[PDB]
Design an enzyme around this catalytic site. Structure first.
Site, PDB file in Angstrom:
ATOM      1  N   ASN A  86       0.825  -1.423  -0.234  1.00 19.16           N
ATOM      2  CA  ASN A  86      -0.208   0.262  -0.025  1.00 19.16           C
ATOM      3  C   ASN A  86       0.947   1.361  -0.323  1.00 19.16           C
ATOM      4  OD1 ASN A  86      -2.344  -1.794   0.413  1.00 19.16           O
ATOM      5  ND2 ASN A  86      -2.446  -1.403   2.243  1.00 19.16           N
ATOM      6  N   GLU A 122      -7.014  12.297  -1.842  1.00 16.78           N
ATOM      7  CA  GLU A 122      -7.187  11.485  -2.768  1.00 16.78           C
ATOM      8  C   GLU A 122      -8.730  10.575  -3.003  1.00 16.78           C
ATOM      9  OE1 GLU A 122      -4.733   9.024  -0.019  1.00 16.78           O
ATOM     10  OE2 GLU A 122      -3.105  10.602  -0.951  1.00 16.78           O
ATOM     11  N   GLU A 129      -9.348   9.798   2.586  1.00 18.59           N
ATOM     12  CA  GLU A 129      -8.649  10.401   3.090  1.00 18.59           C
ATOM     13  C   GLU A 129      -8.124  12.062   2.080  1.00 18.59           C
ATOM     14  OE1 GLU A 129      -4.197   9.212   2.569  1.00 18.59           O
ATOM     15  OE2 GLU A 129      -4.440   9.658   4.976  1.00 18.59           O
TER      16      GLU A 129
END
Ligand SMILES: CCC(=O)SCCNC(=O)CCNC(=O)[C@H](O)C(C)(C)COP(=O)(O)OP(=O)(O)OC[C@H]1O[C@@H](n2cnc3c(N)ncnc32)[C@H](O)[C@@H]1OP(=O)(O)O
Ligand SMILES: Nc1ncnc2c1ncn2[C@@H]1O[C@H](COP(=O)(O)OP(=O)(O)OP(=O)(O)O)[C@@H](O)[C@H]1O
Ligand SMILES: *C(=O)CCCC[C@@H]1SC[C@@H]2NC(=O)N[C@@H]21
Ligand SMILES: [Mg+2]
EC number: 6.4.1.3
Lengths: 673, 247, 261
Positions: free
Chosen positions: A241, A281, A294
């Site tokens: 991630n 995002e 986020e």
């Protein structure tokens, strides 16, 4: 870069590495004196040498040097710095640090404490975005109570469910649950993980988007109510991630979707009263539907890629906003100019879980600054070392062009012409990603590395023509070294009679295969006959330069000779991948058939440390048996923890490693039977 | 490989603390042509390193101390190995390059009973009788008689250089203050003064014992030029059938 | 009226006494002779010609420039003499001046003696009693040791070199005798080691006596560093004269031939 405008004359950079160097460069271009902070280990870093003054703020660990607020405060007070730039990470998104900074007299280049507090937790952010009329991931508002809470929530919001940590960060504390049993076990597992690491024990239940694209929108705001969106960014190639490859424009989005996403990001920034640079995002499915995910209240790591297509200096704009000046650009003044691609060069081995941190000292370091359309953001110089206390990032390589194809070609050239000797890097994976057919076409997703390399990264798979070219280059280099070995100075006592050889007949062992090569030299041109194929290699044959450029049948190739032995072993970096070949003469190859094979005993019976670092947890006792997938031990290094499996089942004869030790690379841990 | 190639990776290879050790083979690889080094006895007496390399295409012999093994101290085996390598290099007109980081000789009863004096004299003789050009670079430490044994200026050395971290001294600060200030009972200031005005290459530089204090990044370019001017070195010695090496 | 004449006599009477009568008595109590007594025993009577009698150390650090820290000769007596009519060059280290530690003047005198000996082609005999390098000198003592080592190596195989250790020799004082042709020791009063027992205890963590670590028996029976050991000083000097009778003066001369019966 107008020097007439008045700004702070002293800025302290409360960070390290390449971001500190970039901030120092921008401040120097603006005629601002800088102040650098560092630990004892980072005493000879690039940023401490390229900045005026330097303050040691503690020992090696981040918790005592770069996360130590007090030392930063006496450094600021002693240096009388008027402004402070935190960069990204560390204390950049710490609200209490901002409060203490704003307490006495110090201005903070960044968002207001209220904005950070709002975009600090993943729950309140969702409600505030919903109140701001921003598309959000479907889910249940509020903290899930217990297992039964999660299992009844999972019924309505799809079959796949996403379990997230409220205080999670850096791609941690997240899990995917499919069945009800998975949901109820993952609830407890993630609660324990959050309590151990984040110390928050609050979880979020949401819908999981299948095959999503991660699209960022860069927003710039001021203290006068003006907000701008600086186009989008594609950040989809991730492992653990964490992003590795980014693109400034998006090949997936059109004008209308980009405008809608930018307007939503600006609306969110206005709702939170953002007055600095930040990023919003989103996750976008195949149907071009975007959901908010986020907001980062700091400078993005991949910011420079959006500077190439916009022509703006983001750090300079942040400094100007912190001073109090309004934005000098309008929304109509922001435009896309070409294409830009960025790759993160890390100090890690891509053959182990798409990257495993590695330590070492850099013996050789050379950037391709002379190549067209190349920018390098690095806090690394020759002689620098990589420790276990900080992020393993070596550099950020950015290439721009008139379109995607030119940017990708320049990226490939820059990766080929980029020299790192001393540590293991991920340049092979980076070069293999940008030339992948799916990536070139533009059909990518967050789960790109996991389905292009289901069994892990293995390196560039040579075609027949590529294999022939590599064999020809290796044979030509071997013959060039042999010819160079015969050039002595004149003796006038015992004249040297050079061996007049026409054809060099060689056996070249590659992977597990033997090839017959016939090489001839006519000046600087080598005619190579590989298994019935004729090739011509042309080069200056400089045997000392780290980079060697050759022309095979008109095709230009840059290769690197990493190592060479008198026994015939050679390591050649070709097309970004390191290949180990063994070259012998025909007579030597024929006589080698009589050599006995020496005994080697690995048999997967000894398990060593996959990376150096500090052992955190051990769960294996001598005598106790293990099985496939059994967790052996956990080592924490360079901000990440890795726990290894056991492999083939067997009985652990002994456990040399102990908890809390400092184990290095290639150190025996478990001698399982 | 250009003879004036810079080596900036050596600017910080020597740690600030004297307890931490480094690899001299890294420096040797950085300095020599194409980073190619043919080591002799790599698995025996690892506290010293000897081998063959090339500088500007000319064969050179390399002798150096290894701080990784036994903190770089000299003992019987390393002394014999280095002595014989130096004798061979001198006998066949091969120039010598020395890298010095040594705190003295290895203490203990075993070394004394084995005849450490004889083998130390062997190495000192081998460096003293050499008439080939010799270039010495001091990296961190050169203490006591070992500093003499490591091809000092006073053994008819040609060029001697000291890095900014070099420390040429009779012994450590604590022993020196305890043997000088026997009853001064003022060690608090004695330590500071002694480490300020001795724990540095200045006492050797002011007396001309080292030709210059050079930046590490310019080491290679400094050596090659020297090898250009020392290739025609000729000296005369008294006639003898042969000398009496302390073998 | 000038006091230059009385200054010469005072300096001579100070140099003849070395480091003082009390230190001479302390040396005598240990069972050892002074450097001048050893020289007188070694050489034929009325044949010793001394050089560099008035040479003093030039150190000016740690209070060494004071009058009480200045000794003519500076812990070494150097000169030339004759053994059975044959020329020889001799130096004897004086333990009563700064423990016999080697300074710039000490090394200068030794180097001058060796240079003259190699110029004329005569053997060198060295009576060694020195505590090592003078720490107050600094790198000057190291330079002097290196000069002595270079002259020892240069003269190897040209003129015979004899070493006789008559006291505790430590540090860099043990390497010059090792480079000489022959090494002799005196029992119970001479030592040869690089580091003292205290450093051995500090580092290796083992207990050893000075005699055990570097005594004459250790270096004559199980070390191979020394060649012979003698009972006391007088016997050592007598045997040294007897041994010197065997050797030629230089490598340019044939083996000595004596009258035979
Ligand atoms: C280049 C190699 C080096 O750096 S060598 C550095 C010197 N190494 C040492 O271990 C210290 C030397 N001294 C000793 O080892 C012992 O004192 C030995 C030699 C065993 C003397 O034994 P002993 O017969 O009992 O005499 P002692 O202890 O009473 O000493 C008398 C005086 O001699 C002096 N002395 C000796 N060496 C030096 C020296 N290098 N520099 C300056 N002074 C020296 C001592 O200061 C001592 O003075 P004092 O009369 O006791 O006040
Ligand atoms: N609901 C979801 N559906 C699918 N993937 C998701 C979802 N939530 C998170 N992810 C995945 O997790 C990744 C990281 O998400 P997120 O940005 O929230 O994490 P983070 O650790 O807070 O990030 P950062 O390092 O930017 O602070 C995303 O890029 C995406 O691949
Ligand atoms: C630690 O010493 C280095 C911190 C590296 C920060 C990287 S990049 C931005 C992401 N945000 C965060 O908190 N860690 C990640
Ligand atoms: Mg994120």
């Amino acid at each position: 870069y107008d020097p007439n405008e008045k700004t702070f004359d002293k800025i302290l950079v409360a960070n390290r590495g390449e971001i500190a160097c970039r901030v120092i460069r921008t401040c120097k271009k603006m005629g601002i004196k800088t102040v650098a902070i560092h630990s004892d280990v980072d005493a000879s870093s690039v940023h401490v040498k390229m900045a005026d003054e330097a303050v040691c703020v503690g020992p090696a660990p981040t918790s005592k040097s770069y996360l130590n607020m007090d030392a930063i405060m006496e450094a600021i007070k002693k240096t009388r710095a008027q402004a402070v730039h935190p960069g990204y990470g560390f204390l950049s998104e710490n609200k209490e640090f901002a409060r203490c900074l704003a307490a006495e007299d110090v201005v903070f280049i960044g968002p207001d404490t209220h904005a950070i507090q709002a975009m600090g937790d993943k729950i309140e952010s969702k409600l505030l975005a919903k109140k701001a009329e921003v598309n959000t991931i479907p889910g249940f508002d509020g903290v899930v109570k217990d297992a039964e809470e999660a299992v009844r929530i999972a019924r309505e919001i799809g079959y796949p469910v996403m379990i997230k940590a409220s205080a999670g960060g850096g791609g941690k504390g997240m899990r995917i649950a499919w069945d009800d049993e998975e949901t109820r076990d993952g609830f407890r597992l993630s609660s324990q993980e959050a309590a151990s690491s984040f110390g928050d024990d609050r979880l979020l239940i949401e819908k999981f988007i299948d095959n999503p694209r991660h699209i960022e929108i860069q927003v710039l705001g001021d203290k006068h109510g003006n907000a701008l969106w600086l186009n989008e960014r594609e950040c989809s190639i991730q492992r653990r991630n964490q992003k590795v490859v980014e693109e400034a424009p998006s090949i997936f989005l059109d004008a209308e979707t980009r405008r809608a996403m930018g307007e939503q990001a600006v609306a969110l920034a206005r709702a939170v009263k953002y007055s600095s640079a930040g990023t919003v995002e989103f996750l976008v499915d195949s149907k071009k539907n975007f959901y908010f995910l986020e907001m980062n209240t700091r400078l993005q790591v991949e910011h420079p890629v959006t500077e190439c297509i916009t022509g703006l200096d983001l750090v300079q704009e942040m400094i100007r906003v912190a001073k109090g000046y309004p934005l000098r650009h309008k929304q109509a003044d922001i435009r896309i100019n070409g294409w830009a691609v960025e790759c993160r060069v890390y100090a890690e081995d891509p053959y182990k879980s798409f990257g495993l941190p590695s330590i070492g000292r850099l013996s050789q370091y050379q950037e391709p600054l002379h190549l067209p359309g190349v920018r390098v953001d690095s806090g690394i110089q020759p002689g620098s070392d990589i420790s276990i206390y900080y992020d393993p990032m070596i550099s950020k390589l950015i290439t721009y062009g008139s379109d995607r194809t030119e940017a990708l070609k320049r990226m490939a050239d820059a990766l080929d012409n980029y020299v790192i000797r001393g540590v293991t890097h991920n340049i092979a994976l980076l070069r293999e990603v940008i030339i992948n057919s799916r990536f070139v076409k533009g059909d990518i997703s967050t789960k790109f590395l996991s389905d292009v390399y289901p069994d892990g990264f293995k390196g560039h798979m040579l075609t027949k023509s590529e294999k022939n070219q590599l064999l020809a280059i290796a044979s030509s280099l071997f013959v060039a070294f042999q010819l160079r070995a015969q050039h002595f100075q004149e003796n006038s006592r015992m004249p040297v009679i050079k061996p007049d050889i026409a054809n060099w007949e060689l056996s070249v062992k590659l992977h597990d295969k033997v090839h017959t090569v016939v090489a001839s030299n006519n000046g600087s041109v080598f005619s190579v006959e590989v298994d019935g194929s004729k090739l011509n290699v042309t080069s200056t044959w400089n045997l000392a330069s780290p980079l060697l450029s050759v022309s095979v049948d008109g095709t230009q190739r840059t290769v690197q000779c990493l190592s060479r032995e008198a026994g015939g072993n050679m390591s050649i970096q070709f097309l970004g991948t390191v290949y180990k070949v063994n070259i012998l003469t025909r007579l030597a190859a024929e006589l080698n058939k009589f050599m006995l094979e020496k005994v080697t005993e690995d048999t997967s019976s000894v398990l060593r440390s996959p990376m150096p670092g500090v052992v955190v947890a051990v769960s294996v006792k001598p005598g106790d048996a293990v099985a496939e997938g059994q967790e052996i031990c956990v080592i924490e290094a360079m901000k990440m923890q890795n726990s290894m499996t056991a492999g083939k089942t067997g009985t652990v004869k002994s456990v040399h490693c102990q908890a809390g030790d400092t184990v290095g690379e290639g150190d025996l841990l478990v001698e399982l039977e | 490989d250009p003879s004036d190639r810079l080596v900036p990776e050596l600017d910080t290879i020597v740690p600030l603390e004297s307890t931490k050790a480094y690899n001299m083979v890294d420096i040797i690889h950085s300095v020599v042509d194409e980073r190619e080094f043919f080591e002799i006895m790599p698995n025996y007496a690892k506290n010293i390193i000897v081998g063959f390399a090339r500088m500007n295409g000319r064969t050179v012999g390399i002798v150096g101390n290894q701080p990784k093994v036994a903190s770089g101290c000299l003992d019987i085996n390393s002394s014999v190995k280095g002595a014989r390598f130096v004798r061979f290099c001198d006998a066949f007109n091969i120039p010598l390059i020395t890298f010095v980081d040594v705190p003295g000789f290895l203490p203990g009863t075993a070394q004394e009973y084995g005849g450490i004096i004889r083998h130390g004299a062997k190495l000192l003789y081998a460096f003293a009788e050499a008439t080939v050009p010799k270039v010495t670079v001091i990296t961190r430490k050169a203490y006591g008689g070992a500093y003499d044994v490591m091809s000092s200026k006073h053994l008819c050395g040609d060029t001697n250089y000291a890095w900014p971290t070099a420390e040429i001294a009779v012994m450590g600060a604590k022993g020196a203050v305890e043997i000088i200030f026997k009853g001064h009972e003022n060690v608090e200031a004695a330590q500071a003064e002694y480490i300020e005005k001795f724990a540095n290459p200045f006492p050797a530089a002011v007396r001309g014992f080292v030709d210059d204090i050079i930046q590490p990044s310019s080491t290679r370019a400094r050596i090659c030029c020297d090898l250009d001017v020392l290739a025609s070195k000729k000296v005369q010695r008294p006639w003898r059938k042969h000398a009496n090496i302390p073998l | 009226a000038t006091s230059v004449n009385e200054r010469i006599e005072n300096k001579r009477r100070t140099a003849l006494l070395g480091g003082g009568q009390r230190r001479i008595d302390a040396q005598h109590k240990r069972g050892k002779l002074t450097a001048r007594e050893r020289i007188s025993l070694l050489l034929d009577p009325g044949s010793f010609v001394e050089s560099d009698m008035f040479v003093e150390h030039r150190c000016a650090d740690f209070g060494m420039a004071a009058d009480k820290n200045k000794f003519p000769g500076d812990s070494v007596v150097t000169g030339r003499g004759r053994i059975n009519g044959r020329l020889v060059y001799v130096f004897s280290q004086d333990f009563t001046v700064f423990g016999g530690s080697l300074s710039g003047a000490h090394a200068q005198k030794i180097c001058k003696i060796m240079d003259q000996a190699i110029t004329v082609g005569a053997p060198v005999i060295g009576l060694n009693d020195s505590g090592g390098a003078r720490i107050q000198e600094g790198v000057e003592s190291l330079a002097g040791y290196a000069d002595i080592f270079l002259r020892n190596v240069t003269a190897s195989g040209v003129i015979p070199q004899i070493s006789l250790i008559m006291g505790p020799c430590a540090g860099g004082a043990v390497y010059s005798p090792a480079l000489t042709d022959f090494t002799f020791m005196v029992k119970d009063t001479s030592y040869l080691f690089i580091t003292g027992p205290d450093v051995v205890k500090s580092v290796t963590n083992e207990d050893v006596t000075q005699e055990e670590l570097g005594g004459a028996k250790t270096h004559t029976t199980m070390s191979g560093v020394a060649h012979r050991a003698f009972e006391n000083d007088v016997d050592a000097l007598c045997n040294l004269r007897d041994f010197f009778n065997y050797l030629p003066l230089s490598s340019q001369d044939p083996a000595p031939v004596r009258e035979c019966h």
